[PDB]
Amino acid sequence: SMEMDEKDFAADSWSLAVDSSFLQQHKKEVMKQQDVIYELIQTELHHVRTLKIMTRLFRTGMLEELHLEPGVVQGLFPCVDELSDIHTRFLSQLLERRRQALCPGSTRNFVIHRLGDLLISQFSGPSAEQMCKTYSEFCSRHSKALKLYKELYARDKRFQQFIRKVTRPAVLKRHGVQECILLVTQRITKYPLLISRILQHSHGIEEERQDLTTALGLVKELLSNVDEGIYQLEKGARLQEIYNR
Amino acid sequence: AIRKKLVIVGDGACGKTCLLIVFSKDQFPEVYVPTVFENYVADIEVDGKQVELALWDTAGQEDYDRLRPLSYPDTDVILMCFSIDSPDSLENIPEKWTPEVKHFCPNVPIILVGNKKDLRNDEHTRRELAKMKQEPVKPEEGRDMANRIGAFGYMECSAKTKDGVREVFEMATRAALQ
Numbered sequence: 001s002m003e004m005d006e007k008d009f010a011a012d013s014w015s016l017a018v019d020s021s022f023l024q025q026h027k028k029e030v031m032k033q034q035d036v037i038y039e040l041i042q043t044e045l046h047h048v049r050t051l052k053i054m055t056r057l058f059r060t061g062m063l064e065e066l067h068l069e070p071g072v073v074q075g076l077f078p079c080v081d082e083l084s085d086i087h088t089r090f091l092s093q094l095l096e097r098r099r100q101a102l103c104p105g106s107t108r109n110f111v112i113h114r115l116g117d118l119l120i121s122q123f124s125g126p127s128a129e130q131m132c133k134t135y136s137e138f139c140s141r142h143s144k145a146l147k148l149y150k151e152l153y154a155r156d157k158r159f160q161q162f163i164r165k166v167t168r169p170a171v172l173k174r175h176g177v178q179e180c181i182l183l184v185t186q187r188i189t190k191y192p193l194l195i196s197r198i199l200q201h202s203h204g205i206e207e208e209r210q211d212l213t214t215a216l217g218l219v220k221e222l223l224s225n226v227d228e229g230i231y232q233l234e235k236g237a238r239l240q241e242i243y244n245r
Numbered sequence: 246a247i248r249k250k251l252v253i254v255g256d257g258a259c260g261k262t263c264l265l266i267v268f269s270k271d272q273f274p275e276v277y278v279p280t281v282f283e284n285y286v287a288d289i290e291v292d293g294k295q296v297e298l299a300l301w302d303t304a305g306q307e308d309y310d311r312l313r314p315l316s317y318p319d320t321d322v323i324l325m326c327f328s329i330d331s332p333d334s335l336e337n338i339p340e341k342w343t344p345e346v347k348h349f350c351p352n353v354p355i356i357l358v359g360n361k362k363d364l365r366n367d368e369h370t371r372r373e374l375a376k377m378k379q380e381p382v383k384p385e386e387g388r389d390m391a392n393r394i395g396a397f398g399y400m401e402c403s404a405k406t407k408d409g410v411r412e413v414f415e416m417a418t419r420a421a422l423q
């Protein structure tokens with residue numbers, strides 16, 4: 001992550017991020033709505049960061065320092081470039097919505113009143129098809145990535161030294177290779193939880209309540225489609241085991 | 246320090262997310278209670294042994310039968326949660342959660358945890374449950390379910406007051422070490 005966005009999302013909540021004299025000007029319901037919207041953007045910022053650790057720290061580090069067999073790095077980090085593209089674009093949209101809402105003379109005081117339309121756009125049309133295709137491929141390659149990781153760590157000395165070196169810093173404590181893969185797989189099922197709670201506090205404007213209800217429906221349709229498109233790949237699985245599923 | 250992995254399972258309203266949040270912060274948040282939990286690696290010392298215990302939640306995965314099992318690989322200990330204010334969450338333990346965890350995590354110890362124990366003597370909870378001919382889960386009902394499903398043990402806690410929270414995670418660490 002970049003320092004500017006890290007500082008903007010350093011506080012535990014929107015109510016602790018904004019100036020107290022700005023907080024005091026809003027009703028309790030607005031603060032409750034803004035605290036959950038802040039959590040959605042803060043967790044999206046962290047999820048994009050998880051994907052950068054996978055692409056730049058792990059994947060690129062292995063290509064530039066190790067002599068792994070071709071197709072091994074792809075097997076460890078399936079679809080990471082596509083995932084990074086989808087979420088970096090989504091994060092850019094969320095951060096621009098916050099930036100446009102800042103008060104003049106402030107880099108921290110804002111209120112996001114119109115999130116629903118952005119969520120409908122993200123979870124419909126081509127961007128939704130790309131998310132469905134990418135997570136169906138990623139989640140079907142999840143178990144294979146973990147087993148390939150475990151094999152390499154146990155049998156390859158230079159691979160083990162590389163892993164131990166780049167994961168030693170305290171800021172990587174929660175972000176080992178297997179942890180990053182599960183963090184990515186679990187990301188998509190966090191969205192309905194966050195959207196339902198934002199909706200709970202968005203009844204003040206009927207257009208917004210309707211848009212968030214539509215977005216919630218679209219996320220659920222996407223999740224059902226991904227869930228139905230998963231079948232775990234296994235290295236060395238025979239055709240007979242596959243067609244006898 | 247040895248690395249161990251813990252996963253919490255249970256129904257949507259069982260309090261699993263709040264339990265992980267309170268333990269990882271060592272506090273019930275006074276300003277904002279997070280909606281979700283990403284992951285955490287706790288430094289725990291139990292009975293003289295240092296362990297790095299990675300914590301994972303299954304919240305949001307309850308309706309997705311092919312995404313949810315992806316949380317289980319290499320799990321060392323399962324916390325199987327129910328809410329004491331929800332006798333219905335206890336009834337889903339033996340024939341939904343238990344056969345699933347036994348299939349994907351064979352031989353992994355399961356600790357059955359009764360969450361929200363503070364609601365057992367809450368009058369609003371007792372009134373609401375009495376409308377559906379129900380009462381808060383009794384300690385013996387929790388112990389008997391844990392005995393029946395082959396759980397390693399039975400424990401109770403309150404994420405709201407922190408009572409019993411540290412003990413659940415210290416015991417889970419001991420189960421993961423066996």
Ligand SMILES: COc1ccc(NC(=O)CN)cc1
Pocket residue numbers: 310311314344345348
């Ligand atoms: C949702 O995913 C599954 C959950 C359980 C099973 N198998 C059994 O529970 C066997 N008693 C298989 C798949």
